[PDB]
Here is the input.
Amino acid sequence: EIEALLEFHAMRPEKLRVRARHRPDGSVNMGDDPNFWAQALPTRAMDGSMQRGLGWSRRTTMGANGVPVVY
Amino acid sequence: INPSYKWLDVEPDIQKVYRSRCMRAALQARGKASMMVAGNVHYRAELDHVTEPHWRERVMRVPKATERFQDPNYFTRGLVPSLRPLSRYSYE
Amino acid sequence: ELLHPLPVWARRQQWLKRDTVEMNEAILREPYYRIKTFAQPAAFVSPRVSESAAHEPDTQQSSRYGVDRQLRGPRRAVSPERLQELREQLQFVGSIGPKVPPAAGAGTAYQDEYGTRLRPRYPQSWDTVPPHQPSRSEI
Amino acid sequence: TTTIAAGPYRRVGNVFIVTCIDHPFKFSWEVNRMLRELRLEFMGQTTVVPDIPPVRKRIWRVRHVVRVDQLDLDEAKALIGIPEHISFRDLAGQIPPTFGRGGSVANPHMRSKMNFMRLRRMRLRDVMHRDQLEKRLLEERHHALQQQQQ
Amino acid sequence: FEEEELLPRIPGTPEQRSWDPEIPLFLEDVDEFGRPPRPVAG
Amino acid sequence: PRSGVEWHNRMRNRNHYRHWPWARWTDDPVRFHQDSVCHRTVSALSTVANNGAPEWDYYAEVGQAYETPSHFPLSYTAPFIYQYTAQCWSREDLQSYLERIEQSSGLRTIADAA
Amino acid sequence: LYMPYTPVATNPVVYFDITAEGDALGRVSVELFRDVVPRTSENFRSLCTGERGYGQCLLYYKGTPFHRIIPGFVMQGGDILTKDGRSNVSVFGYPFPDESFEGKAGKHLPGTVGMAHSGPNQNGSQFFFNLGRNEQLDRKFVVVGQVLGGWEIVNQVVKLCGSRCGTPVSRAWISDCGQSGGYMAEETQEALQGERAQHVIPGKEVLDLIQPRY
Amino acid sequence: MAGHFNPTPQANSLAATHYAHTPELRHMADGAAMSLSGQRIPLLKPTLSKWSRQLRSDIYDELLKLPLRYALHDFRTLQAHIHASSGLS
Amino acid sequence: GRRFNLNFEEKFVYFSPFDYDRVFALADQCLERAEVFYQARNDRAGVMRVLQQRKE
Amino acid sequence: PAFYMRIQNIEGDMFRFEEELMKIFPTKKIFVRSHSVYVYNVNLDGRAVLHHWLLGLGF
Amino acid sequence: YYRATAELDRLRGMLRGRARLERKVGLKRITFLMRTQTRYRVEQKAHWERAIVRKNVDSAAHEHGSGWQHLRNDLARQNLMLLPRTQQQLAQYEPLAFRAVMELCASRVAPPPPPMTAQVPEEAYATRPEDPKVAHPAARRQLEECVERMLCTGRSDVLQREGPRTTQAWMDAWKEYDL
Amino acid sequence: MAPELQLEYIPIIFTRTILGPQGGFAGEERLIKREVAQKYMSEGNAVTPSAEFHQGVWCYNPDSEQYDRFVERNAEFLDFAARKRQWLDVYWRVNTGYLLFGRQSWGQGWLLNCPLRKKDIAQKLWEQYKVRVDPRLIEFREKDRRTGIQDLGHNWCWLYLPGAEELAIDREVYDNKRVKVRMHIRKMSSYGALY
RNA sequence: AAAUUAUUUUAAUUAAAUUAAUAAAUAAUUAUUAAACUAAUUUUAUAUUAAUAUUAUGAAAAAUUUAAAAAUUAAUUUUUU
Here is the structure.
């Protein structure tokens, strides 16, 4: 946890602000919900269509430290 | 007591209920589940009464102002763990 | 608008309606199954309780005597042990999986003779219609 | 013979033959929903649904629309000439699962991409065929070459 | 379904059985109308 | 009553309730889908000991129709205990445990063991 | 009763938790001959750990019943879509063809799993645990592995639940499957750790005893 | 909140062997094995770009698994990314 | 096909030559049997001129 | 946000090329044209799958 | 909006006065008189036209003391299956044959039985001990019931013998190709 | 107990014999609504079940008009106050209830085209009120003995509650042997109407 | 306000809420283009979405509900190639 306190507190705020119309999961964050104005994981619109359709493994999703990326 | 006053319970474990529902609804499919379950909507009226048969009297009982404020010396002598004088209403 | 009365024939043919529904829900409260015995006949008369006004008894010129000809007749698979005596003879020709060829006397398999994609040249005609486009059954 | 018959007791289900006697377009959106789950839309349509429990409700809600008929399974194994020993969970284990209008996927697009790939696994079935001819000729062209030097 | 006992023994879906009073209640170890005719009927 | 547009946006997976039950089943906040039965045991012979521990009540919250009257012997609560402890002891193994209890101890009946 | 095999190092060792008649039998730890059939031994490995998610269906052996058991010959299972045993899919999305019969994969031995197929070049998910030396299955069905743990478990499933016609006399299925070693053993564990599960199936109080994810 | 004081049922015996019901948290949660598994920013694997040609093994299996004619080079020999002074560049 | 995202299987209408051509199927099957007759006879010069014939 | 790929610089028989994409993407609509090979519904992760293949093929 | 003029432009030749001369009134007339025919014809002509045919056969069944009320139901009793458009051809051009159908229904002759559903040949309940050379008892059951029916249809040259032709050797016509 | 959460109904031992549905009779224990019961414990018709009253209670006779009649509640009376309650619970349930319908009525005479059966009243008794009876007891009026109910709007018909003579039950119900079940036939189109 | 030019076709539907010195703007609908198969069941049955385009405030016969209504209003299933 101590390592996460820093990796979250040494991020320039702009890396946290709401940064795209589609939240990293795929929903469309409209206005009026102050909780969802914070987009920690950065979205990637043009990436990830191989997963969940071609039988590509969940092993590919994950990053180098093991935690999955979302698409 | 009064079916007009409701609470919202969130029980944190989602597997604790899912892995029972998937049974409770797999048992009652084979006709092997009993309908006197606590969670049955129409049984709760009788369920309480099988276990606590005089619960009406446990909430209807009016407390004398003596016992509602148990002897403050019993608090210094430590007999009663901590006096709560305002918590007087039985919300069951 | 509803001005002149419903003609009588309509009300009468609508009293047959509620007496259709009153005959559906008689079917939709039957037991989900029927505890039956192997040895006994299949349905010796054994209908539902539908002997309110029983008809078509004539055993011919009766609609059901293509079926109850065989139900009332003595049941051949007369025991659960007799079933395996009968169920151990049937094969499955096309099912997915492996087999044991020499189980027969001298038969030499077909699908390993004309390949898997080729089908026998069925004579196409009006009465005889064989399966068409066989390469669409592979899912 | 005045005796409860004695023997190993098999139980036989029932199979409902359902028809449609009233038009569907007069009824609600829920009653039309049940008829849809009985493969019934037009008047005079007819289907053969099982007597399993959640079908018994669907048929019940629309009793005023359909005309049911019940068949014990032995009274079905004879309606189509069937040997008594052959069950039905081996007869169905023979028909392919891709019968006419294979699946009912959640919307006519997902239908049209369930029929698409079905028309692809045909293309791939000939293409996995056409290279399996090459991969065997290639593995031989290797051995002809390899054993050439010996 | 009959193989995994999944077919219920009580005939008629839950909602249906509340609708029609001819499917008798499927009480087992009690009498339908409360107390049994303790009084001799005859 | 489920009126309102947001119930239209979230029953159907509309704009940002696009994966609406944001916590559906198949997530456990507590035990993260790993069985809580310690396999790291002092002696390898006794690793099979912890198998079959109750993770919750298993019996009351389900509400099965135990038609066993409370005066039966213990050996007639085995068909219930098993359905939650298979993968731990074969059914015919319980009937070796749920008999040594009846033989050795002074307990015989379901009412006694309660 | 005895069971030899061909022991190998650094291969996936995959286990089923076979259940029959509501009596959990145990755990049948297969090994997968990766060194010879790298394309097939992966398809099996992927369907036994729920790794590869949705293709045409829930690509996962957990729950699916042994639709075809023949006493003394084979113990077939799989057929993930329409579990009553008439389909064949791969994690790839199409029924791929068999790789090799050269050796160690074209020898159906009395303790060895082979990936059954409809037509020669159409391998899929349906396997079978060979129960005897079948010299007419050599060169045709590709051996994918071998049974390390619990031969008496499978030699029972064939007794209780097997009939000459092939269709089972009772119920039997795969109450659980997973990977217990080999290559990508832990690298699959990170693919399955966390709150939200990969696949959604009835609680393990159901699949284990009562019903086989029909 | 007031915590957990006014201690547990206040009974004692040799038996004392029937209860866990850790407060949910002290059961894989407050044994903080991996809850950051969901709440930690990912470190993405090598990314193929238009300019940066960083290969990845995780994708290369999804080709090495395929039933493809025209086989592919083995991964290690497909790598541009690994004795004067322990070998020069 | 004039549609793309619904009723679009009509752009990928495929009919296997093993259905709409029977003289081709046989020709593929004769040579396949000619592959196994040389497989037993061990005529590797022949199994090629079977395969290199069949693929063409 | 619905993407397609385009394989523009190929010569040879695209069909024996496109018949090797099908085995990769058994679910993406692939069309062949004179110069290119369009494969639909495949975004910048599919772009990454190709080059890990066009390197494996040795090009 | 396309009025199919060149499809009507030459067909005003059979309209009456003002319609033929001018065009925008000629079309308007015919593209209505045409637009009502093909609406009269789909939904209205039958349930009129098929009532002349019913009024004919009726009053031609009426001559023989029966009604349409009784004939329409006494035909389907005898499984006789003559569409009313045909009974009207018989009512007129073949009166005797029609009254033959009339006198049949009034007769108390047993109508034909409903067709029997398919039956289970009892050889399915024996297990042939599989010998290579002997046929299954259920095939030589089916065959004999398919060859006796092939000799049933049409006067042919096939082993032409009076009445019933030769069978017990017709079932074994494969040996005639044997060496 | 709180001023907000009050018992919606409370236990009560009746001393008098009240006619109304919430009413009881001599000596039975009943959970009647709180507001009603609270103006009984002041009125004297009822007393909360102290352990003393659970054996006997001095009920009331209109003869001398005072609380003299001692009605001791042994196990035998508790088999009498059950059958006498279970009886007049069917009474006060069908008499209080107003069982609705939805029917089709094409035509002018406001005539239900498929008129009602005594089957179709016991069916709407068990459906809505769960009152399970014999449809042989339901006597229709004179206007609807011929053709069934047959007409929209408010119809009523008599239900005969036979077994009320050994319960000593009169003057505490409006009619010892009958009860007016009160139909109503709310015509509806094929959308919501049956039959 | 009046018009807006090319038949033989090949996927369906209505909606009714925030606001208006009272309707060019928003939802919701419809539309164009495109999408991915999360437990629930039959071996049933399922138009769910994204992206853009969008000069709209009032729902037959019922079932009832406001109102002197003397209909309007709420209502909600229709709404023909």
Remarks:
- Helices of chain L lie at 34-41, 77-96, 119-128.
- Residues 102, 186-189, 191-193 of chain L lie near RNA strand M (CB under 10 Å from a C1').
- Chain L touches chain E through eleven residues (CB under 8 Å).
- DSSP finds three helices and nine strands in chain L.
